[PDB]
Design a protein around this ligand. Structure first.
Ligand code: NA
Ligand code: NA
Lengths: 412, 206
């Protein structure tokens, strides 16, 4: 607990940019793209007010659009007077991916009609398309094979405070080991992380901060409409903060909270607000109506685990179940606690043999070990119960492919 | 099964993709259905065997579906999963190994079920070739059968050896196969693929 992330002061004009969303549509061959930029304003609207969106490739401008405020008709009462949408045509766009993170710079400028600037906002824009077609997750029209890992925000000395040096270290180490995707383990991450994944090329699954694993039953609060406002806040604010990042390709509703009506409501909300990304959720059997992807936790390649209400099928048998059409990506597999990752080759043989088996996220990246000091003042790695803490789960906090200081395990 | 096989045609659908042979195939299908449509033991109609995939097969499958909706129709030619079958019915597809032939791939039966867009049940029209000392890996097929719902079994090839009785100089009978009668280019002992001998004596694989 504490103030573990950065605190800052922001000064904005009275008439200001309050919100903006960037969207990229494409044609069939991806030779033509449209950048849709929706900008919202706060303060008193004036007729001289303008918004310009310019797209930049390096130092070269490739597109620009200027318009006054006032969107199209939405319903019988009109449209948003304090909003504007710009459509920038891009011919032969350079496509973002994990292999080539081609990035554009979009600058949103609030300015008067005579030309004076009031406030500028900028974001990195990647031209990519994520969709599930015929049971396969496609990126830019091609089926994806997720070489993913779950990552917690952990530091052996600073706890859960993240710095840019450690983030860059983690991303470089992941890409040097042929990882192309990262799952934000069970909460939204430090904002710089998404930017770094945009610049370096990692696919990101962004997860809402919602876990109720210790509830009996697990959906006790997530099936209660009295907790729907809290969960809805935790989902909507994450999407609103991170919806512009090209590295974010999949939304996650959370982790291990059973399956309730709140999950269905929030999945539908995400699908309505941001149709450009699929939504996944594992709780309740990993194949409910609140997931676009079958995402089992630690399902095996060939052995079924028929638990009473939430069976864990083998991933090959799961695909062929009557009525099943969705792709399967394991949200957690190949538990890396200690001397682990036996049978990894079996998972990857199945991944390359079955089309709709589109990979998974290894659990997990780094051991959540802390640094204590002995009587001689020397540091050592500590796990659960080494601080005197009330009933603990000992060494089950260390499931990483690298040590806390980011030294690789042999399983890496 | 209708009396329609064109295995030796090159390509196999040379006549079954020709509308000049549609009347003959249609007779061979319609008269079989008309004769046998009242029998309760008959649960599945088959369009034939190893004749490629042509428009004649599609036409006759649709005819059977119109005339007798109470039985599904299956057909293996053309890749065992075309529009002329209600059931994926591969010949000798394996449990775990894919056999990617250029135009008619033979997937493993577990991989076949999960192919994008695939919803049909899989019953092997021919599997576990019983030629001589055979049926190794039968337990693997039946493990997969009991583990995967849409894997609904198959038909072993086959029941009885098609061996004939010849007599030696001493007048004693012996089992003969292809080429023992002087017959023009033959396929030797490939006629004996049965679980029982010609006199219906069981093989050890039974
Ligand atoms: Na695959
Ligand atoms: Na079955």
């Amino acid at each position: 607990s504490g103030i573990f992330r950065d605190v800052s002061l922001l000064h904005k004009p009275t008439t200001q940019i309050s919100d903006f969303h960037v969207a990229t549509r494409f044609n069939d061959d991806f030779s033509r793209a449209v950048l849709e930029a929706e900008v919202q304003m706060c303060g008193e609207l004036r007729d001289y007010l303008r918004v310009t969106v310019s797209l930049w490739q390096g130092e070269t401008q490739v597109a620009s659009g200027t318009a006054p405020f006032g969107g199209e008709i939405i319903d019988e009462r009109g449209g948003y007077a304090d909003r504007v949408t710009l459509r920038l045509n891009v011919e032969n766009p350079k496509l973002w991916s994990a292999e080539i993170p081609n990035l554009y710079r979009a600058v949103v400028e609030l300015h008067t009609a005579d030309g004076t600037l009031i406030e500028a906002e900028a974001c990195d824009v990647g031209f990519r398309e994520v969709r599930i077609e015929n049971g396969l997750l496609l990126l830019n029209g091609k089926p994806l094979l997720i070489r993913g890992v779950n990552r917690h925000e952990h530091h052996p000395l600073h706890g859960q405070v993240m710095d840019e040096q450690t983030m860059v270290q983690d991303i470089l180490l992941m890409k040097q080991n042929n990882f192309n995707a990262v799952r934000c383990s069970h909460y939204p991450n430090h904002p710089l992380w998404y930017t770094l994944c945009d610049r370096y090329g990692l696919y990101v699954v962004d997860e809402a901060n919602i876990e109720t694993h210790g509830m009996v039953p697990m959906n006790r609060l997530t099936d209660d409409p009295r907790w729907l406002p809290a969960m809805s806040e935790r989902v909507t604010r994450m999407v609103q903060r991170d919806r512009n990042h090209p590295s974010v390709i999949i939304w996650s509703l959370g982790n291990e909270s059973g399956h309730g009506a709140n999950h269905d409501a929030l999945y539908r909300w995400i699908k309505s607000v941001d149709p450009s990304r699929p939504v996944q959720y594992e709780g309740g059997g990993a194949d409910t109506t609140a997931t676009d992807i079958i995402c089992p936790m630690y399902a095996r390649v060939d052995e079924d685990q028929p638990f009473p209400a939430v069976p864990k099928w083998s991933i090959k048998k799961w695909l062929s179940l009557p009525g099943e059409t969705r792709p399967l990506i394991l949200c957690e597999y190949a538990h890396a606690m200690g001397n682990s990752l036996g049978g990894f080759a079996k998972y990857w043989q199945a991944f390359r043999q079955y089309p709709r088996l589109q990979g998974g996220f290894v659990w997990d990246w780094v051991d959540q070990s802390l640094i204590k000091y002995d009587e001689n003042g020397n540091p050592w790695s500590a796990y659960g119960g080494d601080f005197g803490d009330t009933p603990n789960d000992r060494q089950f906090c260390m499931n990483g492919l690298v040590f806390a200081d980011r030294t690789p395990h042999p399983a890496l």
